[PDB]
Amino acid sequence: TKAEKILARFNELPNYDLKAVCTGCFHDGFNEVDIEILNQLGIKIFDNIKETDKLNCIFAPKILRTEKFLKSLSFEPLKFALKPEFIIDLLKQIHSQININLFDYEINGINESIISKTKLPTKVFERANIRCINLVNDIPGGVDTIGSVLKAHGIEKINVLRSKKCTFEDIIPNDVIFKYVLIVTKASQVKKFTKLINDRDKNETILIVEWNWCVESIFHLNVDFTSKKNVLYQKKN
Amino acid sequence: TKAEKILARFNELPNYDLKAVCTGCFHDGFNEVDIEILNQLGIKIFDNIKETDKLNCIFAPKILRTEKFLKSLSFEPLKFALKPEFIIDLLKQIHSQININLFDYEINGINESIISKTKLPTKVFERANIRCINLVNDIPGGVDTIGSVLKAHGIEKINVLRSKKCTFEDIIPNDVIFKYVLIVTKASQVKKFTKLINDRDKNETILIVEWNWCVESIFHLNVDFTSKKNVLYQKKN
Numbered sequence A, B: 001t002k003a004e005k006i007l008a009r010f011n012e013l014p015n016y017d018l019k020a021v022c023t024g025c026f027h028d029g030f031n032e033v034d035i036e037i038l039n040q041l042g043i044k045i046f047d048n049i050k051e052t053d054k055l056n057c058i059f060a061p062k063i064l065r066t067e068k069f070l071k072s073l074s075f076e077p078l079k080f081a082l083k084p085e086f087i088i089d090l091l092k093q094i095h096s097q098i099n100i101n102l103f104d105y106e107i108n109g110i111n112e113s114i115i116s117k118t119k120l121p122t123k124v125f126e127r128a129n130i131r132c133i134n135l136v137n138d139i140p141g142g143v144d145t146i147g148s149v150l151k152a153h154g155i156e157k158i159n160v161l162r163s164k165k166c167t168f169e170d171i172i173p174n175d176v177i178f179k180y181v182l183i184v185t186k187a188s189q190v191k192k193f194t195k196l197i198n199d200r201d202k203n204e205t206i207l208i209v210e211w212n213w214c215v216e217s218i219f220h221l222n223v224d225f226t227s228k229k230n231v232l233y234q235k236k237n
Helices: A002-008 A032-040 A067-072 A085-094 A112-119 A143-152 A189-200 A211-220 B002-008 B032-040 B067-072 B085-094 B112-117 B143-152 B187-200 B211-220
Strands: A018-022 A043-045 A057-059 A080-082 A132-136 A157-161 A180-183 A206-209 A231-235 B018-022 B043-045 B057-059 B080-082 B132-136 B157-161 B180-183 B206-209 B231-235
Touching: A002 A032, A018 A067, A018 A080, A032 A043, A032 A085, A057 A067, A067 A143, A132 A143, A143 A157, A143 A211, A180 A211, A189 A206, A189 A231, A206 A211, B002 B032, B018 B067, B018 B080, B032 B043, B032 B085, B057 B067, B067 B143, B132 B143, B143 B157, B143 B211, B180 B211, B187 B206, B187 B231, B206 B211
Parallel strands: A018 A043, A018 A057, A057 A080, A132 A157, A132 A180, A180 A206, B018 B043, B018 B057, B057 B080, B132 B157, B132 B180, B180 B206
Antiparallel strands: A206 A231, B206 B231
16 A cells, blocks of 8 residues: 555556566565555566566676576566666656656667577577486586576486496486587596597587586577587587 | 606795685686696695595685685685685796795785684684574575585574575574574565564564675674674664
8 A cells, every 4th residue: 555655646657567587686675665566567576487477577787697597588588688777767766757668778788689589489408409418416506506597498307417426327318419418517527428428339429518508508599509619528420 | 647747847846735625716627737736736626625625725816705715714724815826827837946935826805814713713603602593595595505604604503494484483593692593685584584583582682684794704704793784683682
């Protein structure tokens, strides 16, 4: 009711139609009334991303590598990538007509072309034919967060390998082109993996990459197999 | 070995006597020869922190909030906080006498006074009488990494609270001053905890803080109970 009274001063309220999470901003959240005001203007802020909520918006000061920012590039679709200043200006204007627009707060780097790719009927790793991958347990950020980002972007199976207990038999193939795909952190995990695979499956193909290969692929919503950047080893026909 | 041949060119080798981890630098690591080179020079680089390794050194470009940086402030003791350029200049000098010193590469804000506090026979939260704390699981970084930092710094028991599945009975007291200590992320969570506790234990003391309160206490190796910075609520008698 207290938000309703504040908004009563207005002859007509915009419906911004945003379903958003915030990352790299609003770390302590919003007070009960601001949430109510925002809701009344068709803006719902969620704490976590649930595929259920059909999120369409991300608030962030810039392109970030957080789980949330990367995951927003798998929204279905992402419609708005907005700087926090949008909410700030909007709440400011409201707390004493409403004309804050959705166009003057775009995040540098996230443009029409990238955003529209979130409308594709496939995910980035899905159209790259990277379905089942191996991840070394010493991935910075832990394996659950990385795993969940990758699954959001179309990877079907995330197989965690522990360096350095893992054998060839723990490596899973990429059944959907590369038979083995691995994400590794230390450039000496490469040697061990290429030896194991070369010994047991000599003629098969292998792709070994750093987490930043995944990151850049998500940022572009495209796996560029042409790039050598963040590729630690590849064996193809 | 290859490392030995390279080092044979020197008529005397320093023993730097470092046992270190790196954070915010050398993300891919070192090749097999460099590791052996540094080793011959009394510099051991570890991947993760194990209390048994008795680390005495952190390599980092500046003061950081990573798990490794914060934990280096509980080494026993921390002897050197060094910029990665120390390793870079050392390796460069070696690959073509050895005179790179440990004094010209200190990290800013780190300090002989802070560094020497790591020799104390207590940990920072231990002398602050914060033994048992409650952590809300929506903390950015996950609880087990937050928990690991705090245990390293003398907190005996990290109790994880689920907002909003948690109840008064899930809250554990600080039995070693404040009977209840909570770390909370969302400002709107404070209301809920203080209501629960006030209803059930009206006369007892309560301290509720943001994660940055812990971080700064670690950075200073002191809990300043005089500070209102990052304190969300406190009830004292």
